[PDB]
C-alpha cells in the first residue's frame, strides 16, 4: 500500500534479520505474487500481505515474465521496481 | 551521432579553455559520483542524451530502451556505444546533473520529459540550470539536474 | 608460458591471463591428439 | 603475484578441474584457429568472376567483344565481450565456516572462492557451447527472452543461406518421411571441389532412437542409421561420417562438412572464462568476483549446411 | 540503398561453384559487349545517376557544368559507371551506341524504349530496344538489357 518502505531480498533465520533494499534503490529480481493472473508488461501493486498483484499504484513495478508456480501457493515472478509514480 | 562522422578540414586550436564543453560529443555528466548506478540496455533508435523507456517485444527477444517520457519514463541515456548498440542508462531513481536535449527556457524553470525524450517547460522531473544552447538548426541542449519524479 | 609449467611465475595479472589462454589452447591440442573418433 | 593475490593462486590451482567443452567434438583440429581480440570485428575479402554474355565468334573483322566481370564481397565477423558476477566467501572468513565435511554456509548458499569459481566456469562453458550450436543466448527452456546480439554472429543452426528442410507435423513419427527430407536436402548440398572430406551429423536423442529401427516389410541387418551413413557417403566421396547426439538439440538434424575451406571457427583466444582482477570487498564476510568470456567467430560458406526441423506442433 | 556497391557487409562467403546467372547484379559496371574504339567521358555527378540516362546541367557560372539523371529532348548520354570518391560519372555520348543493363521504370525483347524525365527506360522518339525482360533486384529497382542507337523518330 502507501506504507511501503522497501523489499526484503534475504533473511538470516538464526539471527532473525532481514536484508532490505530501500524503495529509493531500483531492483530487478523474483518476488512473490498473489496469484498466476500476471502477464508480461503488466502494472503490479504490492498488497497488504506484501505480494505483487495485477492492477492507484504509488510505485512503478512492471513484470518481466509470467507467474511461475513452485508450491501450492508459491508464485514467483520476475519484476523490476524503479521508484515511485506521481 | 554523438561523434561527428564527417572529418574536420582543419586542426583545432587548443589555446582557449573557455566554452569548450558545449558540444554534442560530451558524454556523461558535469558532476559524477563514483556511487552512481549505471546500466546498459539494447538501443532502439538513437536515444542519446534523451529520456528512455522500457519496451517489451513479443517475448522472443529481451527488453530494450527507446527514447520517450511521460508516465513511461525509466531513465536517462548519458552514453551510447555504436559498435554494440548499447545505451548507457541512469535509472530515474538515481539523480543526474548534465546536458540533455531540449525541445526547440531559462534557469529556474521546471522541465518534464515529452513523448520523444526531449525536455520541455511544464509532475516535474528536472530543473533547468542554464538557457537553451543551439548546436544545429533543430538541436538544442540545456544543463539540467534530474531529481526523480514529484508532482 | 602455461599454467601446466610449474616453473611459471606470473609477474602480474596480465601475464596470468596470457598463461590461462595458453593453458586452454594446449588443453585443446591435447584433447584432439587423444581423440580417436 | 601469487604471494600477494590469493585469488590468482586459487584459480591457477583449480583451473585443471574444469572440463573441456563438448563443442570441440563438432569440429576438426584444423577447423579452429584462435584470434587475438576481445570486442571488435575481423573482415575478409573474396573475389569472384562472372560471364556477362555469350562468347564472341572471331570471324573476319570485329571490335565489340563480350566481357567478363568481377565482383568483391567483404565478410565481417563480430566479437562480443560479456561478463558474469558471483558471490563467495572471503579468504579470511573461510576458517569460521570450515565444517568437518563441507566448507561454506549451507543455509546462506555461500561457497569458498575456489569452488564457486569452478561451478561458475562450468555453467558459462555450457552457455558458450549452446551458443556455438544454436546461435542464440537464452536461459529459458522455452527459449524466449533471448539476448539481442550483434549481426554477423551466427551459430551452426541459425546460419543463414543454408539448406533448410521442414518435416510436417503429421509425419513426425514416420522415419521414412524424415529420411525423405534428408535426401532432398542432401541433394541440394553444393560441396563443389571440396566433396572429398569427412562429414558430421548431430541429432537429438529422440532422433537417435528412431535411427536404430530396422529399415523399411522390415529389413534384415539394415537400419535407418546404416542407410543414412551410405547416403552421406555417396556425396562425400565415401569419406568418414561421424554421428553425435546432443541434448541441447531438440527435433533437429544438422549435417555439415568437416573441411576448413568451407566452414571455419575463429574464436577469440579469450573466449573461454577468465577471472577479473576487480574483487568487491566489504566489512562483512561476503565478496564478489567477475568472470569474462568472448562470443563469436563462426564462419561458413553458403549452402554447405543442412538444417532439418521436425515440426512437433 | 541505391549505390553500386552495397554498404552493408555480407555475413557469409559466397559459393563460387555455379557459373550461370551470376551477372545480373547492380554492381555490374560497364557494358556486356565493349569495343576498344568507344568514346567515354567523365563528368561531375549531380545526385546519383548511375545506370541512368543523363543530361547536361548548368549552374550559375562559378562552377563548371555537371550531369544529372534525365531524358527526353535533353538527353546527352548514358552513365555506365561512377566513382564515389571523386564523384565522377563516366558517360558514353548518345552519338556512341551502348549495350548493357540499364534502369527500367517500374516488357519483352523487341520492345521500343525511350528515356523518361528521371533517366529511366520506359515503353514507347525511340532510343533503344529491349534485349530481355525486366529483372527485379529490389522492390523498385528493375534492370533491363538494352542497346542504344541514338535518336530516331
UniProtKB/TrEMBL annotation, chain A:
It comes from the Bacteria. This is DUF228 domain-containing protein. It comes from Borreliella burgdorferi (strain ZS7) (Borrelia burgdorferi).
From TrEMBL, chain B:
Pfam families: DUF228. InterPro entries: DUF228 (IPR004239). Keywords: Plasmid. This is Uncharacterized protein. It comes from Borreliella burgdorferi (strain ATCC 35210 / DSM 4680 / CIP 102532 / B31).
TrEMBL record, chain C:
It comes from the Bacteria. This is Uncharacterized protein. It comes from Borreliella burgdorferi (strain ATCC 35210 / DSM 4680 / CIP 102532 / B31). The chain holds residues 187 to 223 of 230 of the full protein.
Automatic annotation (TrEMBL), chain D:
It comes from the Bacteria. Keywords: Plasmid. This is Uncharacterized protein. It comes from Borreliella burgdorferi (strain ATCC 35210 / DSM 4680 / CIP 102532 / B31) (Borrelia burgdorferi). The lineage of its organism: Bacteria, Pseudomonadati, Spirochaetota, Spirochaetia, Spirochaetales.
